[PDB]
Ligand binder design. Structure first.
Ligand SMILES: Nc1ncnc2c1ncn2[C@@H]1O[C@H](COP(=O)(O)OP(=O)(O)OP(=O)(O)O)[C@@H](O)[C@H]1O
Ligand SMILES: Nc1ncnc2c1ncn2[C@@H]1O[C@H](COP(=O)(O)OP(=O)(O)OP(=O)(O)O)[C@@H](O)[C@H]1O
Ligand SMILES: [Mg+2]
Ligand SMILES: [Mg+2]
Lengths: 260, 262
C-alpha cells in the first residue's frame, strides 16, 4: 500500500549535520509513518545511534549494494514498530569500487531499494562526506534531497559543491528527484541575537541558491547531542523549539500534524 | 623562493568534522614563529586555503597540477601574509586527482614523490587531509613523516581513530607509509571549569584503550574562541587565549624533543 519517498541527507563537507538530521528527522517521521533508515556511511555513526549492533555474519548495506542478498534480508527492525534500518559497518567502503565497476554506480542503490517501495512510507538515507561513489549513489537514490550546511563559510562551500554534484547527476539522468531545501547547522545565537557570522552565512546560502527553501536552523546547542545520547527527541528532552528544523521539513513533505 | 630538511606532518582523520583543518591552521601558524612552514591544502572543499587568506586565480597551478606532474613543485607554492608561511592551495577541481592517483597503481606514494624537490626549502610541511577513505586521503598519509590524528571526544571520534589506524596499517604493510604516528588530539572536549563532560571523558579513555601506544595531546576544548580566531585569521595566543593553544604547544614540544643531538 505504501509508495516510499526516499529522503536523502547530503552535504559533501565533513560535520555538516547529516547524521544528526537523519536521526531526528527519521524518529519524528516515524510518529505516524513507517520509516526505513539507511546508514550509507562507512564510519557507521547512525547505525550506532539507533542502537543497532551488526553481528559478524549479518547482511548490511554492503551486501545489498553488491546484490548478494535480497533487499528485505538487509533490513532490521528497531525498538519502535514504525522504524527499520539497513545498517552499515566499516567494511562498507568496499562498495566504493563495486559501484565504480558497475559503470552505473549513481543508480545502483536507487535500483536496489525499488523492491522495498511498497513496504515503507519514508526511506531516510544518511550520506558520508566527500565526493565518492557512495555519496553519489545516495544522491542518485533521492526523491527528495535535504542539505544540512554549517552556518559558516565552510557550510556555504558545502552547499555549493553539493549542488554541483546534483546538477551533474541530473544531467546524466541519475538524479530525478527534487531538492527539498537547506538546513543551516550550528547557527550561533547569543541569547536573542544572532551571531553576525551565522547570519552572514545563511544570507550567503540564499544568494547561492535563491530557489531553495531554507528551513529553521539547527541551533548551536549541546542539547542535540544530549537528546541523541539518550535516544530521544528534542521535544521529549523538553526542548521543542530545537526540533523546528525537522518539523519544518515534515510540514514541507505535506505531512499534517496530529491534533487533539 | 630559494632553497636553504623538511619534515612532513600530515593531519588525518577519516570521519568528517574531526578538527583536521583547525589543527593544520593553528599548528602551522604556531610552528612558523621559529620555522619556515609549507601548508598544503589537500581537501577538495578547500577550507584551509580560505582560512589562510589565499584566493586561487583562474589559471593558477594548485595541488592538482602538482599531483599530475604538470608543473614543478615550486610553481604551485604561494607566499602568504606571514613571511614564514607558504601554501600549495586547493580548489574544487582537486577531486580530479582521485582519478589520476587511482590510475597510477601507486597513488599512495605519488604525493610523497612530488614533494621531494622541496626538501631543502622548508622546515615543516603541514598537510590538511579530506575525510573519507579515498585516493587523496590515502596519498596524504603516504606522504607523512609524522602523522597526527585529531579525533572528536565522542564515540564518533573513537571510531575515526580506529578506522584511520586501519588505513595507516594497510599502507605501512605495503611500504607506502614509512613515517611515525606523532599522536592523537582529542577534539571538542567539553569541560566546564574542572568538570569534564561524561561523554568526553568516556571517549578519551576509549581512545587510550584503542591505542595505548600513542601519545594523547592536550585536548582542543569545545569553545567559540577557536571559531573566532580562525575567522579572524589569527592565533589563539594572539587572540588572547594562549591556554586554548595547549594542544599545539604540546605537539611543538614533541617535535622539538625529536631535534637531532650529538
Ligand atoms: N574548539 C572548537 N570548538 C567547537 N567547534 C570548533 C572548534 N574548533 C573548530 N570548530 C569547528 O568545528 C567544525 C569542524 O572543524 P574542522 O573543519 O577543523 O574539521 P575537519 O576535520 O577539518 O572537517 P572536514 O572533515 O570537513 O575536513 C568547524 O565548523 C570548526 O570551525
Ligand atoms: N546543534 C548542534 N550544535 C553543536 N554541535 C552539534 C549540534 N548538533 C550536532 N552537533 C555535533 O557536531 C558534529 C557533527 O555533526 P554530525 O556528525 O551530525 O555531522 P555529519 O555531517 O554527519 O558528519 P560526517 O561528515 O562525519 O558524516 C557532531 O559532533 C555532532 O554531535
Ligand atoms: Mg555523518
Ligand atoms: Mg577540513
Amino acid at each position: 500500500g505504501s509508495h516510499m519517498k526516499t529522503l536523502v541527507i547530503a552535504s559533501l563537507s565533513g560535520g555538516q549535520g547529516k547524521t544528526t538530521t537523519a536521526f531526528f528527522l527519521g524518529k519524528l517521521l516515524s510518529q505516524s509513518a513507517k520509516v526505513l533508515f539507511i546508514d550509507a556511511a562507512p564510519q557507521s555513526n547512525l547505525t550506532f545511534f539507533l542502537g543497532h549492533e551488526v553481528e559478524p555474519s549479518a547482511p548490511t548495506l554492503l551486501e545489498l549494494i553488491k546484490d548478494m542478498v535480497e533487499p528485505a534480508d538487509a533490513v532490521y527492525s528497531l525498538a519502535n514498530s514504525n522504524q527499520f534500518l539497513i545498517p552499515s559497518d566499516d567494511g562498507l567502503s568496499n562498495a566504493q569500487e563495486y559501484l565504480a565497476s558497475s559503470g552505473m554506480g549513481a543508480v545502483v542503490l536507487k535500483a536496489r531499494l525499488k523492491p522495498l517501495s511498497e513496504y515503507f512510507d519514508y526511506c531516510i538515507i544518511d550520506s558520508p562526506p566527500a565526493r565518492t561513489q557512495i555519496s553519489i549513489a545516495t544522491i542518485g537514490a533521492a526523491d527528495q534531497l535535504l542539505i544540512p550546511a554549517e552556518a559558516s563559510t565552510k557550510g556555504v562551500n558545502s552547499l555549493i559543491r553539493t549542488l554541483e554534484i546534483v546538477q551533474s547527476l541530473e544531467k546524466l539522468g541519475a538524479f530525478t528527484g527534487s531538492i527539498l531545501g537547506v538546513i543551516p547547522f550550528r547557527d550561533k545565537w547569543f541569547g536573542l541575537s544572532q551571531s553576525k557570522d551565522s547570519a552572514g552565512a545563511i544570507a550567503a546560502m540564499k544568494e547561492v541558491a535563491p530557489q531553495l527553501r531554507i528551513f529553521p536552523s539547527i541551533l548551536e546547542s549541546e542539547r542535540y547531542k544530549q537528546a541523541l545520547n539518550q535516544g530521544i527527541l528534542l521535544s521529549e528532552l523538553g526542548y521543542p523549539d530545537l526540533e523546528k528544523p525537522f518539523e519544518g521539513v515534515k510540514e514541507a513533505l505535506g505531512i499534517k500534524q496530529l491534533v487533539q
